[PDB]
Amino acid sequence: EFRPLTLPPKLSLSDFNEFIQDIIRIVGSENVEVISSKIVDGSYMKPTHTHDPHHVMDQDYFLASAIVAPRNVADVQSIVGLANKFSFPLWPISIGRNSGFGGAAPRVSGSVVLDMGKNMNRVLEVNVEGAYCVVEPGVTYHDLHNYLEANNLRDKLWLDVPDLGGGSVLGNAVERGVGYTPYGDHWMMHSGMEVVLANGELLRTGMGALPDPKRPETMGLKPEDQPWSKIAHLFPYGFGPYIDGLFSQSNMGIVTKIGIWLMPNPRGYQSYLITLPKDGDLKQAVDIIRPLRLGMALQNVPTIRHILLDAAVLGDKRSYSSRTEPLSDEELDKIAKQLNLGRWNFYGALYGPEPIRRVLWETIKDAFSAIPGVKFYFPEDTPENSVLRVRDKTMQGIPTYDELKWIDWLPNGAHLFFSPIAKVSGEDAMMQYAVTKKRCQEAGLDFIGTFTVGMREMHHIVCIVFNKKDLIQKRKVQWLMRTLIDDCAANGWGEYRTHLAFMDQIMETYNWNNSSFLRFNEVLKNAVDPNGIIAPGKSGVWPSQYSHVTWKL
Amino acid sequence: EFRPLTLPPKLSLSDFNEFIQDIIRIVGSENVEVISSKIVDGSYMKPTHTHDPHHVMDQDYFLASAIVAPRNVADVQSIVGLANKFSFPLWPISIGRNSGFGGAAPRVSGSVVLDMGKNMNRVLEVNVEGAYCVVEPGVTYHDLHNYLEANNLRDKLWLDVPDLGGGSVLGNAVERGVGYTPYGDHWMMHSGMEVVLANGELLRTGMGALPDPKRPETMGLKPEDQPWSKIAHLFPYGFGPYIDGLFSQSNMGIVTKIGIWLMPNPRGYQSYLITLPKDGDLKQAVDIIRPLRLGMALQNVPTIRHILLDAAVLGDKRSYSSRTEPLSDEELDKIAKQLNLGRWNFYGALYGPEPIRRVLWETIKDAFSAIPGVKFYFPEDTPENSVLRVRDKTMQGIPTYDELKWIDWLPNGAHLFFSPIAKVSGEDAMMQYAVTKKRCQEAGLDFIGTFTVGMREMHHIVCIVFNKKDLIQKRKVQWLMRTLIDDCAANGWGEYRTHLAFMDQIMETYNWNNSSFLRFNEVLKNAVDPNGIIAPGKSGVWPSQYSHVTWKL
Amino acid sequence: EFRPLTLPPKLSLSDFNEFIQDIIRIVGSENVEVISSKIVDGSYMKPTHTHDPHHVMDQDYFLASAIVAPRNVADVQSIVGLANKFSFPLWPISIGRNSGFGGAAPRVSGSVVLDMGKNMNRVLEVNVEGAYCVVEPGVTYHDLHNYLEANNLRDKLWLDVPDLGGGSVLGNAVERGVGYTPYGDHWMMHSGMEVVLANGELLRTGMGALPDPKRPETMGLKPEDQPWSKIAHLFPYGFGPYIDGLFSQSNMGIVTKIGIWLMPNPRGYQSYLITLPKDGDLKQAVDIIRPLRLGMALQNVPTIRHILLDAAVLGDKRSYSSRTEPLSDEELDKIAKQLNLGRWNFYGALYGPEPIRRVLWETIKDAFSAIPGVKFYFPEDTPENSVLRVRDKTMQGIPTYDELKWIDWLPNGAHLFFSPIAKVSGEDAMMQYAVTKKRCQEAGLDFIGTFTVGMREMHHIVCIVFNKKDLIQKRKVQWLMRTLIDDCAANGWGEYRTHLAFMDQIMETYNWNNSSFLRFNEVLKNAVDPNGIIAPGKSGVWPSQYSHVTWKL
Numbered sequence A, B, C: 001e002f003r004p005l006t007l008p009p010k011l012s013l014s015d016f017n018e019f020i021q022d023i024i025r026i027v028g029s030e031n032v033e034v035i036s037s038k039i040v041d042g043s044y045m046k047p048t049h050t051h052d053p054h055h056v057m058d059q060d061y062f063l064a065s066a067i068v069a070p071r072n073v074a075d076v077q078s079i080v081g082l083a084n085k086f087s088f089p090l091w092p093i094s095i096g097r098n099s100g101f102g103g104a105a106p107r108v109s110g111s112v113v114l115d116m117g118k119n120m121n122r123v124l125e126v127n128v129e130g131a132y133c134v135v136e137p138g139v140t141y142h143d144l145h146n147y148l149e150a151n152n153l154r155d156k157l158w159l160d161v162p163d164l165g166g167g168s169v170l171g172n173a174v175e176r177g178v179g180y181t182p183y184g185d186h187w188m189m190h191s192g193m194e195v196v197l198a199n200g201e202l203l204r205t206g207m208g209a210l211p212d213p214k215r216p217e218t219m220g221l222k223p224e225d226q227p228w229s230k231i232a233h234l235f236p237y238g239f240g241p242y243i244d245g246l247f248s249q250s251n252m253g254i255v256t257k258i259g260i261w262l263m264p265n266p267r268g269y270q271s272y273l274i275t276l277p278k279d280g281d282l283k284q285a286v287d288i289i290r291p292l293r294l295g296m297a298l299q300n301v302p303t304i305r306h307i308l309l310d311a312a313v314l315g316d317k318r319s320y321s322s323r324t325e326p327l328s329d330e331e332l333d334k335i336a337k338q339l340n341l342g343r344w345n346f347y348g349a350l351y352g353p354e355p356i357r358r359v360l361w362e363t364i365k366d367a368f369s370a371i372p373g374v375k376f377y378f379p380e381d382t383p384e385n386s387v388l389r390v391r392d393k394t395m396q397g398i399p400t401y402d403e404l405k406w407i408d409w410l411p412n413g414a415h416l417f418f419s420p421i422a423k424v425s426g427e428d429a430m431m432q433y434a435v436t437k438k439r440c441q442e443a444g445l446d447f448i449g450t451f452t453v454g455m456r457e458m459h460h461i462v463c464i465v466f467n468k469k470d471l472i473q474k475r476k477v478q479w480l481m482r483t484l485i486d487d488c489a490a491n492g493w494g495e496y497r498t499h500l501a502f503m504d505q506i507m508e509t510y511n512w513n514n515s516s517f518l519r520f521n522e523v524l525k526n527a528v529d530p531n532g533i534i535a536p537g538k539s540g541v542w543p544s545q546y547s548h549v550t551w552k553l
């Protein structure tokens, strides 16, 4: 194809054409869409691979020149080798459902979006004795689930899913996303991964670097196709430098396979809901959660959900008030009463044999009872369309899609995640929450959020919903985010993850000792990708060809 | 003036004298010893910092030209730029008690050993709600146990210790070393770490990149002295590339501070011994352990110890036998009848409330019953002198040095570790034990070794004890080590950790795809340390100034 | 031509086309086949110049982009100059019958296969007083023979041929192949050669560097066309460095002419066969051969042939057993009796006047008689289709093609040579033979082999035959070879020659002092071929543009 919508940096239209024609020759026209005109948002079921479907910028700000779907790893080696020849940036996606953080879109306009999971979608292995799987990019959570369910494996191994099943297992891991069983730190639960580097070369990290001994049936296989050794996915460190983190939220390589640990079926399980009546209950509740989480009475990643999250699953805004402006604290309580919920709602789960669940539940019951008005529930005890029935599945690794609903709080709706980290402390959870709220009212948005409760640590996921056709809200949303980053960085809170538009501003928060951390990351980046091929601008890590003057926001 | 026994590569006696003069001035000659006469092996109590105290190669083969001890970070910075000026290799050490792996000797003879711990020994912070501490290299496990006792803090926070409590908490963590509570994975339990790079700039990882908000009290501090932000030592990842691992088992920088997570007091503890009468009971032992550990009954890192390991603690070889050759199986299980131990002996522990510890004990106890003639004891049930009583201190974070006794198994005692990783597979462990044993007896040694029980992996620690005034036995020791690597690599096991002399050969077992892993690191190494200053050859990672034909072993 | 089947490294399809069109302009379309689709194996009579006809890899693994047939040396200078312009690797063949070692195929897929002998096939000189010839690449053995036979020269000069006449005289020399008269070391018997270097330049080695003095009839000639001096082909060293070996089994240049010594007609000759009954007779026989070879009672390169070699010439496998699996030792003896042969069969020849042949034959008779059951034969004494009648020709330099037959032991048959060197020692010949056999039974192949008996030295030519359409045998064959290289390198035996697929693994056997020899060869290679044009990957000698990570096997 001939005349794309945007060109990447430096590139002559003839150079594009020589390049995109050399690739039609490798993947076939089957596997190459050049983007030549109007770049539609689509849906969660048909994820757009061209731009950010939940656009806070102009719809076309983050935009591709072309989508390329390699068949196999060898093409990936070729496509990278070819981008070096032509100085052509690439943006690896596995699935492209990174909505809230920019969807499938590249940082540098005109990049090839490299669809790794169209073709490479194979669940390569499920091992029961070692309690692990191995996956290519295209393997979603529903996929991996469906595979398990087909093979009578639900009784022996369980998944850990995020809120929505459509995500990449692999993509989410490298992003360091959060799920909700014991194995919720998707990244911690990885061992042994494969990567194609900017220079073309295939690499296996950890014990993947220990080769599988030669034997009759493995001969003649191409690196990508070769087996792994005994310990590859059992123990991630191997010998020497632990390099695996260089490919999480970074642009040092292209991940082709990953090993993930799966919790074994516990032989017993109990979801539950603790409802917390007053808005100020947050403070004491956190303080009660702290030791329970630290001593493993909270075994999984329970969440503390602001009432508007649960309410937005059950309806859009306009089904509660025909009001323009953020609902009042007085209204927020009326909604809570209508649904049999607190202003905050603690969702969580118990795991193991029942004498053990007994004990820990007796502990949790007792501990939360210090709050006035506290009410406990099991799935049994709730109506059929409740959030607890959804999270009963989620907290035993079962893919749902019901949480999407909260994207249509507002017409033409789109989310953006502001995700500062907080202490498991009342004072700290309350202050940060109070800072976040003020600013959403200042921008005229309803606060919607949730706390994913890590071990010593909470990811506070602020769920900024906005009418994506309302351009005055967009600019207010942008103002909200840029301000919230500074507000929170001014109180010692950083962000674990962002949208394309905020990657630079947030990497400027991590500037202890005159941008030390960024400068070291650049040294590595420029060393392993001399040409600046791989996702330039990812996590604010620009290679040496991109003036930081022009490209940062 | 100063005339040292060896000099680093290519470096004039005058250069050396000028270099040290500068340092002696910067640091004061209390903190400089030059190595100018015939290099004492030393004790654990006061460890040598010149050469390998447990020497498998010649005593003078790994030998430092001098030893420097920085007063503070600044001195490290100053020393680094001075090493850069001169192409002078530095070898960082924390405490130096890394014996069985070389201790504090360098790879390259002529290197300066950089004793970090001598001066930089302050428990910078303990933190009760965050359940963490922050330490300099000089904070030993005992220093830190000491600290918590002084402040009556063991009611609220426990430790996790190696078999001996004189290691560096920092230095052990960066070697991915191992303890035996449920925080036994020492590297995995860090968060936030300070590092001086080869260019001498400071760098803090994770949320250590987020600076603590500028206030009037902390103003005008140096970077080394600056407080960390709220989330520093709570959430390890921060934002963007997760570089923490590049400073583990590596030569990418000098670590000055590290956060470690502390397991809080369970509120209930009880160690236990299970004896396994027969040698063959290992397969079924492992096969039963596999699922008990995956499902988290076995909460800590338990240990399966060969009879001789335990016996070597209670007494030396001579105490049990005048035999020159290795002790035979008839004699070995005689020692089991003497001591009321098995051929193998399982040590593990139970944590948390009485009702829970009951339920897990029941199952552990009734699952292990499938091995014929098995037995069960608590600390109380055994002798006052027994090993369980000792390990009862170890698996609650109380340091001992009682485990040092098995080194004196032979006269002129010196340990050395061969540490392959096994599947949690009865068949696998046995086939590994059988290879390890086979080469021990050809080498003329008593097999001694404990398995550690990780989640999906076991570190099989082969405990090579030898007489070091016996030189015939050192050549056979060397032969043994170099062979067991290649043997185990030929079966698909790799080593997590080694002695100096085996780093080049072991990095060569990780040669999947024509030494791709090693090639990637070398690229990282040369980017971040242009002058090859820091610890060349550490993990066989040679910077471009050291030729692979001259320096590989 | 426009769209080739595979492209070489880096190369845009437009670049290929500019390049292959500039060459159609030099050699004509007469002399350029671009390979645009399905790459057939062909036969010995019609040797394929596209790929390896005896493929152990996938048929298309080693594959060309194009075949170019230079007319004359000047084109060769042009084609090299043009490959430097475009960075286009070239793979020089003379004839392309290097079957067993990869046929005509290149190492790097997409190279031009440079057909040197299509056009340049002229026997340039035959000198009788100096007893030598001079040949271009296309001069085969049958050719050179036919030329001699046309010119009434059989009475004065004799050839030395390998098993098959179709080979290049020149190509085999530079490979260092083996023939079977006194002049069997084809490489030793060279003096004065011509080469085109990677930089374009024509060079004459040895005394070829001494120019032929100016005289009337030699004026205006282009370097290639010029005469040689008096001593050129009479004495190979010349003055200064003996550089000739840089163009044997290497990629330092393109050989355009070579001088070869021809044995003069001895004036008397007697082929013979000594049959050795038991399989274990090998041991003693070798020991008897040793002094006879060392004192020139064995004047030529006699061979010790395993009975299955002789039997495979006389029939395929299926004419002896309809059995899948390797014939038993019990069956191997039944075949031997049926054909009037030993388990081993010693073929050899006597040369000179009959009183001299008498003496040496009386010596050989006597010496071999120490073996029980030994039987001597002349050609007279054997049936017409016997191997001795074939080797009666071979050992007086007469081209045959009868040996091909053994390629059809198995259906769809193809050979591969495993060619370790051995001592003229029984213990050593027997061990190596015993190692080789075990492994062939492990792979389920019949051992077929022969020992070419050099002076102090045997080339043990293992004749691995395999059904080339049976993909499970292929992988077994690959396993056999990769294992046999290590087995034999583990006992001090290296290989004198290999297939494309094994060149890297075998150059890794020659790694004394941390790959010293390879590293020096690279220094030279990168010096004389800066662009990496000439046969990159030949003998595992990769230039600096090819990551050793990607290209080695």
Ligand SMILES: *Cc1cc2c(cc1C)nc1c(=O)[nH]c(=O)nc-1n2C[C@H](O)[C@H](O)[C@H](O)COP(=O)(O)OP(=O)(O)OC[C@H]1O[C@@H](n2cnc3c(N)ncnc32)[C@H](O)[C@@H]1O
Pocket (backbone or CB within 6 Å): A092, A093, A094, A095, A096, A097, A098, A099, A100, A103, A104, A116, A137, A162, A163, A164, A166, A167, A168, A169, A170, A171, A172, A174, A175, A176, A177, A178, A179, A253, A254, A255, A256, A403, A404, A406, A407, A415, A535, A538
């Ligand atoms: C809208 C929404 C989103 C959401 C959620 C609830 C709602 C209503 N709940 C989430 C949760 O509980 N936990 C969580 O981690 N995320 C949640 N989200 C966000 C989103 O649904 C998921 O995170 C989703 O898994 C992310 O998208 P996807 O799985 O499709 O991953 P991707 O878009 O393909 O990749 C994102 C980025 O990762 C890097 N990447 C990906 N693949 C590679 C390869 N192969 N090599 C190198 N880098 C890779 C790129 O930077 C890419 O852009």
Ligand SMILES: *Cc1cc2c(cc1C)nc1c(=O)[nH]c(=O)nc-1n2C[C@H](O)[C@H](O)[C@H](O)COP(=O)(O)OP(=O)(O)OC[C@H]1O[C@@H](n2cnc3c(N)ncnc32)[C@H](O)[C@@H]1O
Pocket (backbone or CB within 6 Å): B092, B093, B094, B095, B096, B097, B098, B099, B100, B103, B104, B116, B137, B162, B163, B164, B166, B167, B168, B169, B170, B171, B172, B174, B175, B176, B177, B178, B179, B253, B254, B255, B256, B403, B404, B407, B415, B538
């Ligand atoms: C003899 C012995 C050893 C032993 C053991 C039992 C016996 C009888 N049991 C162990 C166990 O159960 N678990 C374990 O992990 N190790 C065990 N060992 C070995 C040893 O005693 C301990 O591991 C000890 O804690 C390690 O020694 P130390 O803590 O003193 O570390 P070091 O001497 O400084 O050397 C470690 C290496 O790491 C690098 N390093 C260290 N500090 C730095 C800094 N600041 N910067 C950069 N690199 C650093 C160096 O390469 C150094 O050599």
Ligand SMILES: *Cc1cc2c(cc1C)nc1c(=O)[nH]c(=O)nc-1n2C[C@H](O)[C@H](O)[C@H](O)COP(=O)(O)OP(=O)(O)OC[C@H]1O[C@@H](n2cnc3c(N)ncnc32)[C@H](O)[C@@H]1O
Pocket (backbone or CB within 6 Å): C092, C093, C094, C095, C096, C097, C098, C099, C100, C103, C104, C116, C137, C162, C163, C164, C166, C167, C168, C169, C170, C171, C172, C174, C175, C176, C177, C178, C179, C253, C254, C255, C256, C403, C404, C406, C407, C415, C535, C538
């Ligand atoms: C199947 C078979 C093969 C065989 C044999 C018996 C059987 C049944 N017996 C042999 C024997 O007794 N002795 C021996 O040396 N080889 C034997 N073989 C193998 C094969 O038939 C011959 O070796 C044959 O002579 C080799 O093929 P050819 O003569 O065609 O040479 P080539 O394929 O063209 O060249 C091979 C490689 O040499 C380098 N080369 C060649 N020409 C050049 C020039 N002009 N410049 C630079 N390098 C050159 C290349 O590496 C080329 O690939």
